[PDB]
Ligand SMILES: Nc1ncnc2c(CN3C[C@H](CCSCCOCCO)[C@@H](O)C3)c[nH]c12
């Protein structure tokens with residue numbers, strides 16, 4: 001039997017996931033998260049929001065894998081755009097992710113690097129290829145690129161410029177890299193999907209509140225379309 | 231029957247732990263960590279190093295709890311001092327911890343705060359009381375204070391002074407807050423002990439390299455004395 005973990009960071013990001021799947025979910029509390037466990041097209045689906053940021057998302061992903069035995073993890077949510085071609089509501093799949101706020105440069109380590117790890121964490125090529133295939137069938141744009149994750153909500157030109165110069169990131173959020181990292185450590189295939197909610201600039205807070213609902217729904221709808229192919 | 235999880239961040243922090251306990255350990259790999267499982271004084275001890283930083287430490291602490299069923303978690307390692315009275319080799323027990331690099335100020339949150347959490351994460355009062363009691367009996371100085379944790383190695387006066395002014399922190403490291411946080415989420419008693427390796431200033435890299443071994447041993451020796459009373 002196939003077991004698939006579906007994650008968002010905020011409750012608002014999983015609201016449309018639960019609604020779009022529409023099946024009956026059993027609620028299972030563990031480690032301060034609530035896991036929604038259902039069956040859909042012969043697959044067991046386990047849905048949770050982690051809460052915001054790297055520690056929360058690391059915890060929840062580890063719980064998904066260890067406690068619920070998922071074989072794939074699909075993340076859905078919203079993100080800040082760092083590139084002109086990614087506009088509000090546009091979808092991006094992360095081919096690599098970085099923890100942009102990691103700094104061990106005192107020991108001459110490059111920014112983003114931690115010993116016994118790597119700057120860039122890879123996601124599943126087979127899932128990313130699937131995303132590309134179905135986006136083409138749907139005639140919807142889907143960009144591929146690097147996503148930068150850190151424990152700050154980015155809302156300045158200066159920090160955007162750093163993310164582009166240092167990591168060639170296309171989008172910024174606070175959980176993708178930690179989710180992808182956990183999945184790498186456990187050998188679990190991962191896809192990270194984001195819809196743009198803001199431009200990570202001085203107006204980001206306002207844009208985020210305006211577009212969270214729609215952008216979350218766009219990501220969630222696409223995630224469902226991926227699960228339909230598994 | 232009592233099962234105690236014992237964590238460091240770096241391999242060097244657990245070397246003296248394994249040595250001082252002296253017992254045979256079984257090595258169990260899981261999620262990119264190696265867990266050393268042994269029996270000491272009729273208690274079961276599970277020792278691991280997480281690897282550096284908040285994501286690594288969150289993962290490992292969650293694995294310790296879920297996969298190995300530990301009832302308490304004790305963290306031992308080194309830290310940078312932020313206060314004049316904490317000198318190289320001095321011991322500190324963290325009564326609260328903060329993630330000092332968290333910034334959701336774009337939405338008017340205070341620094342360190344994440345929704346559905348708190349700036350300050352509590353450790354176990356009963357374990358901190360035990361530490362104080364033993365330290366007094368041993369005639370060893372043990373400070374109680376706030377530890378700030380983040381994904382940067384701190385090596386500047388400016389950042390030191392921020393940690394003191396913002397959080398009234400006494401020491402800085404990269405894992406304590408995340409370990410204590412996971413333990414809080416699962417309702418597992420936690421104690422975080424650190425020995426000072428450096429002063430978190432421009433000389434910190436050199437001080438760290440010089441004193442890592444001795445400071446790690448000092449922390450490990452004290453952690454063993456706690457386990458002897460559990
Ligand atoms: N520009 C940007 N920089 C960094 N990340 C993002 C993201 C992605 N998510 C949104 C969410 C923000 C949490 S704060 C809002 C809620 O606070 C109020 C609720 O109490 C966190 O999970 C990261 C969208 N735009 C971003």
Ligand SMILES: Nc1ncnc2c(CN3C[C@H](CCSCCOCCO)[C@@H](O)C3)c[nH]c12
Nearest residue numbers: 107115239282308309310383384403404430
């Ligand atoms: N001032 C300071 N700021 C933040 N943290 C600390 C700590 C506590 N630990 C040491 C270690 C980082 C060292 S990276 C060594 C270079 O990598 C060598 C392996 O390639 C990480 O686990 C945090 C001591 N002094 C500190």
